[model samples]
Target: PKEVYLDRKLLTLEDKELGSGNFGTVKKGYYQMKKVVKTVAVKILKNEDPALKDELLAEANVMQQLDNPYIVRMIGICEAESWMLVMEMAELGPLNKYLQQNRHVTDKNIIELVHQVSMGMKYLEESNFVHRDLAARNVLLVTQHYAKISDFGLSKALRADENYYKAQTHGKWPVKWYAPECINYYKFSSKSDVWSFGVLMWEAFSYGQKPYRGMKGSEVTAMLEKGERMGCPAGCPREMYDLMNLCWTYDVENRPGFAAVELRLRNYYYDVVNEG
Candidate 1:
């Protein structure tokens, strides 16, 4: 069942380009007052190809069904002169930027952010979905204390024994957030997403520092191949770092699934709250 169907007349484009996803360029937009006013993030179709349009529509179909506070809500899809994906707007924008400006943010707040993100991943894990591009950039800072998972234009559904997805050509990917197996075999899975989550945790801890210290794709791949990993960021809690280490484990089978991550984060969240 399609839950989202919007029109151009319903939205006012702000013409503010934010970031490019797999298929579309995300922009800031607003919905007209239809009894009430609403602001939204609109992903406009940049590629005029039919494939991109069809792919986005398919992705929207999946997003329409996801229900969780920690996940972004898709309001509707508009197909006028171009296809547009209307979604809930985050107050402070991406977590990457939010973490940067708030250098003095508390450790307790960091724990809460990670826990909220893991809570969303837990839902995806239960629904058997794989977010191929899970990073701090995809986590939107919706409020002063909450973040929601967004930017799923590269997402895929997980099938039994589907451990990897291949790219036909040697291409550029987010190498730093990628697991070794994912980079080598062009494979992706929930475990791989966990590896990316570990990198996101490091980013939050480091306040938006670049991962791998400006290494190129080949260099990062080589570094991971030699079993080296980025060290713990300053002020990161020991428990969180340990959890991050587990996600970077060389063996995919050994990596904890989203269920374990959610539980661990939940426990950590309580610890922080209790001590705070």
Candidate 2:
């Protein structure tokens, strides 16, 4: 059988906390792999509840199967008092904060991140995995212009016969990012992820501005139903906005897939850089 489990003895945690939320804390840590010591980020599941621990393990299992330069690489999972997901540390942290802190992000930098995410999403689509939550905050920066898709807590793998997954349980949703069917019917697919990716592209182009700005969740649902989409961010390229529009296609069946989206973004990236 394949194994993603690691010995607890190899991981050394630092007092420094990288991030924390209701789930628990992600700490800066070092993983010893025989001869080389690697800096890593360890997400600790603080809750003792069996269900939550199972969820973390499931997420780790999903992450372990993916291998792509633009997707965060999983080191392994350590099962101690609780479970922990060990992953390569993205030193610069989340993309939204990085964009806000920089004040003035270049067009090239914006295109690079957007294109990288499209690349990552293409891999996910090809692998038949759907990232139900795709947003700017979920993306981590390994370096300037180097973005990697992370956080698979809501991801799901599709079966060979399935084109979509219907959610049986739902409490809260990222309404602003959801495709119409996702918001109205609790369904998800790679197409839905593409819709969320459009919103993420909006966030990056606007320097981390909240999507559907100043609108309530209910209001966004209404707008989406009415066939209205967000306007282009200031200074965003017309071509890029057009691509986002494709992702936001009102009809889910008409929206372009990640492969097409990735290729378009790559061509646009070339335009942004070659003009000089």
Q: Best candidate per TM-score, number?
A: 2
RMSD of 2: 1.8
Candidate 1, residues 141-252, lDDT tens digits: the string is: 8786899998787777766666555555554467778888777787788888899999999998888888888688899878777888889888899999998888788888
In model 1, state the lDDT of residue 261: 88
TM-score of each: 0.93, 0.94
Q: Judged by lDDT against the true structure, how good is candidate 2?
A: 0.87
